[PDB]
Amino acid sequence: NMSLVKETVDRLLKGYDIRLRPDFGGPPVAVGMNIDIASIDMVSEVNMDYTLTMYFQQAWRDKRLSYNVIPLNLTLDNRVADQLWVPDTYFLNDKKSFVHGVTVKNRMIRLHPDGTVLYGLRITTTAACMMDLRRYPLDEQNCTLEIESYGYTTDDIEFYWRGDDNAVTGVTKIELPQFSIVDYKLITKKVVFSTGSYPRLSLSFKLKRNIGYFILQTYMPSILITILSWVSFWINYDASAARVALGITTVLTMTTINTHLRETLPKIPYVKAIDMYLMGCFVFVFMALLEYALVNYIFFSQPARAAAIDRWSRIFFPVVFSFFNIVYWLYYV
Template sequence: MDSLGLMWGVLLVSVLLSGRFQVDGRHHRGKRGPEDEDTNRLLVRDTRDDTDKADATNEISKLSNRTTSVTPTMVFLNILDNYDQRLRPNFKGPPVQVYCSAYINSISSISEESMDYTVMLFLRQRWNDPRFVYHDYNDSITLYEKVLDKIWVPDIYFVNEKGAPFESTSGHSTLLRIHPNGDVLYSAKKTILLACPMNFQLFPMDSQACKIKMESYGHTTKDIEIWWSKEDAVLIDQDIQLPDYDLVTWTTNNNCDSHHTTGTYSCIETKLFLIRHIGYYLIQNYIPSILIVILSWLSFWISPEIAPARVALGITTVLTSTTLTVVSRSAMPKFSYVRAIDVWMMTCALFIFSALVEFAVVHFIFKRDKKFAISRRARELSQRLPRKKKATDKKDVTSEDADDQVDFKPDKGMSSPELDQDTVAASEEAKPHRTPAEIKALYMRRARRIDYYSRLLFPLLFTVFNILYWSVYLSWYH
């Protein structure tokens, strides 16, 4: 109990003492002098200055952090501040080396009549521009077509272009990419109509070489030199399928500089080698013409007595052959040289026309007996005339009688009846006169003999022609 009372006493004394100190402090602050007030003001001002310095330091650190994260836009805008797109890189220095590559995506509309074709490709150009060197950004910068007017690009154009370029349906057809070392990649999608001079002497077993030729328009070789890229200069889509041709190979050429009055301009070109498909023309021209020629030979099996049938067949085949010849040239330009298919069509027309002429000869020989009937009547009238008149006309009658007595042996061939008549007239005078039936049978045999020989000769000659034609032209068909 004594210890507990002592503790309470000590606690009460300490409370009283602390209250006294607080009262003295208040009285002391209430009676501060000028020096004390100035000291407090300096302490407050120092505290505020320290706070402002801390805030300024924080703002500076934030701005420094922002400047360290450089954006591609800032880099490009900084480059454009001192950039003049009207001047080429290394102005008044060595020529700019421009390396090109092309990826051909499609080839279409190859026209023989206008000698052109349409190609869609991606043209990529690479060069170095020291004005594009930057160090604030460690990656390449990709730009689009809106900034092309603000930078310099090579003025490359297609020399054999015929038509205006087609507009891209997607709206985005160009790409520009710059690298920290100043290398520039410019890629553009182009759909163009190009001229392709063609030679059709071997048509339809021909091959064509179509060019894609590019050169600088306004800069001579002192300013720009254009080259194909060393690797993958020209690539072609493997899915390209042409209805009339096969794309077999292509070549590139760097040495085709153009020399003009204004200077020498750097040029590059590639050749696309195309081989025509012959299957379509076999079905459209060759096989029908063969069938028409064979059809004309059917007249050799028709009797010469049936003239209307043979005439109709011959004229029909001639007109059909002429139509096929005209159709084969309808989709071609108007040239003067002879094509391979023209040789074929003209030979077929010659065979068909020869078959029609053969019928005319056969029909003439077949009806020759009517002439001898007229000669017999003339002889009977001459017997009734006076003897003097009869003697005067002896030569004429004798010649006419000789006509009645003409006889050809089978080994005489297909010679003309009038020529053979004069040749054997002297030997036939001593022979007895033939009856009209015998004369008619004689000339019918001769006519049918000509048909028989034609059945063998025409197919043989046409077969020989086919062997020569296909062996010669297929040897030139690559």
């Protein structure tokens, strides 16, 4: 009936002291957290942060809110969320987060006959995780989300997932455009700060980059120019201007490609792998130009030395380049 539920809610809210958490003098009150991730919008390297949207759900047993008249599960309008007690929970490493309000503020309050309260939000968080880009692009990230309690010490509150295997859902359906999920882990800890010991949970999942895309875009032009620089050797040493044309154009094109790739890639002001590779190729074409210049200098005295140096260069350069590439790709991958 209507009037029974009305008077039950009225007698529950009457004489309710909000600022006193349940079981004030007794044992800590357990709080179970449950997360349903809808999507991960974007994962940036410039700002070192990722955006996620999730459904956050907290369940806690509360002896004050308890009724035995009606067997139904009462669900209240979200306006009641202010009058009841709610555990304060702050994400430690979020930079800007807001609860979605479209038609109303998206939060649900669901009571129970035995006193268990279920409280749900819909949260969008721009969390921050440090990205180690030494091995960029081929790297693995370990971005996390850290949950804690800010008001109550470990003596008053306890945090635990409601089934470790089924705590976090929807991860398989997540589809990052440039990355791909590999695995996720759930952790429960206690952190010591200067005012006490505070409980915490951690939801941490790996991210692996896709190698297939970056190769064609970045590495192919440099390798093509480096290989095409070698055609300089097959030309006869008589045609000086013709060979110098290639020996110059290769270096100029390498510099231009370096500048373009610097403009395109996400700016990060410390050493990364692709810079090492481009510098290696640049040094190779520079050394080709240098050896031909030396040949042209010592050519007038003895031609046999020139033919010998040309043969040595032909038989040595590709071997050194292949060795360098093999060492590189074996050390990184």
